[PDB]
Amino acid sequence: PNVCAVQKVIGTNRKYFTNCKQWYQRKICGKSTVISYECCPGYEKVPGEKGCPAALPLSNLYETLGVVGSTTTQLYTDRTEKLRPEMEGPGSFTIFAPSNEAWASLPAEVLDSLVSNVNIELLNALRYHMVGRRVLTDELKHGMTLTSMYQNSNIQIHHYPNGIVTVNCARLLKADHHATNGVVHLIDKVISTITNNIQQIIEIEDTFETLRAAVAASGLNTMLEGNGQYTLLAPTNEAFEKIPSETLNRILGDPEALRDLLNNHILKSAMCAEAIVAGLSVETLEGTTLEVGCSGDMLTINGKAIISNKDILATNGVIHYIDELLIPDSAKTLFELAAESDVSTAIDLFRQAGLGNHLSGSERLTLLAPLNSVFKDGTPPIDAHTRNLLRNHIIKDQLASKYLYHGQTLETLGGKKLRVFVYRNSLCIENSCIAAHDKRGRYGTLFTMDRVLTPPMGTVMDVLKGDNRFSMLVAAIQSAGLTETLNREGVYTVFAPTNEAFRALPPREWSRLLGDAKELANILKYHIGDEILVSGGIGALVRLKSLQGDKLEVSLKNNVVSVNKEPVAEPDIMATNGVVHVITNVLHHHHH
């Protein structure tokens, strides 16, 4: 009875006093916890009965400070010789009472303001912690302000979805201790008035002179002066200095890159550090996601403990000081955003082939970079041939793969025109298909691909004529009158049977070709799809209309293309007027 829980991280005095819950966080900021049991606010154990069945009497607000252990608050209240009669007297009051540890751990700046004029400033601080009406935590809505009893100065309230409540980012430790004339809330810090907006803090602090100048040049000072709830992850001078000067001046002197940079430090609502007890994904005003988390008493951004000062309060939100600059992809060159990524091998090869200048400056390009796993079994060598192929992985203009359309053509720096194939569940450029989301830089975009491109060199007939396995196919095509179809412009998919395929036909099948050139033509045309289906465009099952009219059933299973239950021996031989897939038996006519 009257049952409450204490969750202590081990090593500390960091405690979360709660209503007993049914699911408790195993770890708080990566540090495991022990759980304990206390009696709830205002109840005491009697020996021989379990729980805490006895309620304690209410007392006035001054006395309740003692009941919750806020004895320094009492001592200082008694010192003022003014406020204790008010706390014992008529009215309805809230006090956010700092804990003894809070008063004993004053930041040097609040100690400074008190010791200047001790009697008056202690009375003012104590009044700032109070409100002239009772307010329970049920009435503490996120983002509200309460008017304190010091000069009508606002107190800022946050009430996060995980139940943590903060008062000027001080954590509310023990809530809703009723008094005969109000309520006592025990808080974790001594709070002070909030007099500057975010822009004013930028303009005051010498650690933000570089940020200040960037904000001014971008024109963002208007927003940071305005009404709003923001978190600024404010980069210090030291953060900017860690960036090579040629990178930084490139970003700061370009209005689009400068604005994306600054926006990538701003979140759309105010977030006190004490809110964060596990990983949380947030989105910046630039659009990038950051992983906010924590390790002990250190806030982390993407796992890196780069927050050197937490919870600097402004009238329009919260500032946390950050030691590294959060450069978004949209401010980067292609080399900057790709060199340490899933395509870093491919990026290294562009560099070794003398093509790095395309990636390191302001050229408007799209880069087709295969994944590192493509090069698991080795890298091509740095020739003129590899150089030339790599130049044909560099596209003119900055593109977004999602806005590409079927039949679009892309011009390369090697002078080639590559074909875009848009299928239902994949996007391919020639034989190679997009394998991850774009990374959009300032001037160029990285497309991550699953394969090295193989640009076409000749027509279908050039392909078939160049390989000894298709001599019967080439002769049959001529005999069937199909040769010039397959050497002129088109979008064919040729399931090309080898010589062993034709010799495997039984006599009853072969003898249907004898004296019947139109039957040979009909058979060959059944092997020719009327649109280009590279293997990366094949899902569970796709119908492809042949030139004979009936449809082929094409599927991909265990990374092998099949057509009418015939596996492809060698896929994706690209041609200027189609794609060739090799098969080792002739296709059987199916069901329509």
Side-chain angles (χ1 to χ4, degrees), residues 88-89 122 137 174 191 215 258 298 319 327 397 427 555 574:
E88 298 191 297
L122 211 62
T137 52
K174 309 210 243 220
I191 64 169
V215 162
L258 174 61
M298 270 186 298
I319 300 168
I327 302 184
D397 305 339
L427 189 299
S555 63
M574 305 304 297

mmCIF file of all heavy atoms in Angstrom, residues 88-89 122 137 174 191 215 258 298 319 327 397 427 555 574:
data_model
loop_
_atom_site.group_PDB
_atom_site.id
_atom_site.type_symbol
_atom_site.label_atom_id
_atom_site.label_comp_id
_atom_site.label_asym_id
_atom_site.label_seq_id
_atom_site.Cartn_x
_atom_site.Cartn_y
_atom_site.Cartn_z
ATOM 1 N N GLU A 88 3.730 30.102 5.305
ATOM 2 C CA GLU A 88 2.898 29.553 6.374
ATOM 3 C C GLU A 88 1.483 30.129 6.386
ATOM 4 O O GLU A 88 0.658 29.683 7.185
ATOM 5 C CB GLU A 88 3.581 29.796 7.736
ATOM 6 C CG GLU A 88 4.939 29.100 7.855
ATOM 7 C CD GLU A 88 5.518 29.095 9.265
ATOM 8 O OE1 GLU A 88 5.796 30.169 9.814
ATOM 9 O OE2 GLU A 88 5.710 28.004 9.833
ATOM 10 N N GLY A 89 1.196 31.096 5.524
ATOM 11 C CA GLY A 89 0.025 31.918 5.636
ATOM 12 C C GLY A 89 -0.987 31.622 4.549
ATOM 13 O O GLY A 89 -0.809 30.699 3.723
ATOM 14 N N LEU A 122 19.072 36.350 -2.605
ATOM 15 C CA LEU A 122 18.494 35.084 -2.144
ATOM 16 C C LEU A 122 16.969 35.139 -2.090
ATOM 17 O O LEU A 122 16.293 34.162 -2.480
ATOM 18 C CB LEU A 122 19.051 34.727 -0.770
ATOM 19 C CG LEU A 122 19.207 33.267 -0.388
ATOM 20 C CD1 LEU A 122 20.165 32.537 -1.289
ATOM 21 C CD2 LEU A 122 19.742 33.254 1.107
ATOM 22 N N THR A 137 1.733 18.346 -11.417
ATOM 23 C CA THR A 137 2.372 17.879 -12.648
ATOM 24 C C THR A 137 1.353 17.546 -13.729
ATOM 25 O O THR A 137 1.653 17.723 -14.906
ATOM 26 C CB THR A 137 3.284 16.667 -12.386
ATOM 27 O OG1 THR A 137 2.578 15.651 -11.666
ATOM 28 C CG2 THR A 137 4.533 17.087 -11.602
ATOM 29 N N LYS A 174 10.979 14.860 -7.428
ATOM 30 C CA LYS A 174 9.882 14.345 -6.611
ATOM 31 C C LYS A 174 8.706 15.304 -6.725
ATOM 32 O O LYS A 174 8.811 16.476 -6.340
ATOM 33 C CB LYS A 174 10.288 14.174 -5.135
ATOM 34 C CG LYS A 174 11.588 13.383 -4.950
ATOM 35 C CD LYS A 174 11.644 12.589 -3.633
ATOM 36 C CE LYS A 174 12.770 13.045 -2.678
ATOM 37 N NZ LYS A 174 13.475 11.884 -1.977
ATOM 38 N N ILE A 191 17.430 27.252 -10.406
ATOM 39 C CA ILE A 191 17.117 27.873 -11.669
ATOM 40 C C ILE A 191 17.211 29.386 -11.541
ATOM 41 O O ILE A 191 17.184 29.942 -10.432
ATOM 42 C CB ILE A 191 15.752 27.400 -12.191
ATOM 43 C CG1 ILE A 191 14.574 27.800 -11.322
ATOM 44 C CG2 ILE A 191 15.819 25.861 -12.335
ATOM 45 C CD1 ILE A 191 13.222 27.531 -12.044
ATOM 46 N N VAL A 215 26.021 33.143 -39.210
ATOM 47 C CA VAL A 215 24.590 33.442 -39.072
ATOM 48 C C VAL A 215 24.255 34.766 -39.741
ATOM 49 O O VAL A 215 23.232 34.889 -40.434
ATOM 50 C CB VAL A 215 24.194 33.433 -37.580
ATOM 51 C CG1 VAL A 215 22.852 34.148 -37.325
ATOM 52 C CG2 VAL A 215 24.115 31.985 -37.062
ATOM 53 N N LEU A 258 25.961 27.406 -47.073
ATOM 54 C CA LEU A 258 25.969 28.050 -45.756
ATOM 55 C C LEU A 258 24.634 27.835 -45.030
ATOM 56 O O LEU A 258 24.597 27.467 -43.846
ATOM 57 C CB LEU A 258 26.264 29.549 -45.919
ATOM 58 C CG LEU A 258 26.183 30.482 -44.686
ATOM 59 C CD1 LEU A 258 27.142 30.088 -43.647
ATOM 60 C CD2 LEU A 258 26.438 31.949 -45.147
ATOM 61 N N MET A 298 27.174 12.478 -20.357
ATOM 62 C CA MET A 298 27.640 13.084 -21.600
ATOM 63 C C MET A 298 26.579 12.861 -22.671
ATOM 64 O O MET A 298 26.240 11.715 -22.970
ATOM 65 C CB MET A 298 28.972 12.482 -22.071
ATOM 66 C CG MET A 298 30.231 13.164 -21.547
ATOM 67 S SD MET A 298 31.776 12.536 -22.245
ATOM 68 C CE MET A 298 31.797 10.819 -21.713
ATOM 69 N N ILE A 319 20.265 25.888 -26.026
ATOM 70 C CA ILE A 319 21.533 25.805 -26.737
ATOM 71 C C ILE A 319 22.372 24.738 -26.056
ATOM 72 O O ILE A 319 22.557 24.787 -24.833
ATOM 73 C CB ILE A 319 22.283 27.150 -26.736
ATOM 74 C CG1 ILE A 319 21.479 28.240 -27.392
ATOM 75 C CG2 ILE A 319 23.657 26.990 -27.451
ATOM 76 C CD1 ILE A 319 22.006 29.645 -27.188
ATOM 77 N N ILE A 327 28.399 18.911 -40.634
ATOM 78 C CA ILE A 327 28.338 19.303 -42.041
ATOM 79 C C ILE A 327 27.356 18.355 -42.711
ATOM 80 O O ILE A 327 27.635 17.152 -42.777
ATOM 81 C CB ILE A 327 29.730 19.283 -42.715
ATOM 82 C CG1 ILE A 327 30.696 20.218 -41.983
ATOM 83 C CG2 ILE A 327 29.576 19.633 -44.239
ATOM 84 C CD1 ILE A 327 32.093 20.370 -42.585
ATOM 85 N N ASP A 397 25.480 16.574 -65.354
ATOM 86 C CA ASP A 397 24.383 17.125 -64.556
ATOM 87 C C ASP A 397 24.226 16.391 -63.226
ATOM 88 O O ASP A 397 24.554 15.201 -63.098
ATOM 89 C CB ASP A 397 23.017 17.104 -65.253
ATOM 90 C CG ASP A 397 23.012 17.786 -66.597
ATOM 91 O OD1 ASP A 397 23.907 18.618 -66.848
ATOM 92 O OD2 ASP A 397 22.083 17.487 -67.399
ATOM 93 N N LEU A 427 15.470 0.243 -60.349
ATOM 94 C CA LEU A 427 15.910 1.239 -61.316
ATOM 95 C C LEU A 427 17.296 0.829 -61.788
ATOM 96 O O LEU A 427 18.189 0.613 -60.958
ATOM 97 C CB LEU A 427 15.974 2.599 -60.636
ATOM 98 C CG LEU A 427 16.194 3.929 -61.347
ATOM 99 C CD1 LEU A 427 17.488 4.106 -62.106
ATOM 100 C CD2 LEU A 427 15.130 4.098 -62.248
ATOM 101 N N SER A 555 11.684 -14.953 -64.373
ATOM 102 C CA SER A 555 11.710 -14.931 -62.920
ATOM 103 C C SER A 555 13.164 -14.923 -62.478
ATOM 104 O O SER A 555 14.061 -15.279 -63.245
ATOM 105 C CB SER A 555 11.001 -16.152 -62.332
ATOM 106 O OG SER A 555 11.728 -17.300 -62.755
ATOM 107 N N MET A 574 25.120 -6.526 -72.842
ATOM 108 C CA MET A 574 24.423 -5.344 -73.335
ATOM 109 C C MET A 574 24.779 -5.080 -74.798
ATOM 110 O O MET A 574 25.932 -5.229 -75.208
ATOM 111 C CB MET A 574 24.752 -4.104 -72.497
ATOM 112 C CG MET A 574 24.492 -4.257 -71.039
ATOM 113 S SD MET A 574 22.791 -4.734 -70.602
ATOM 114 C CE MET A 574 21.877 -3.287 -71.226
#
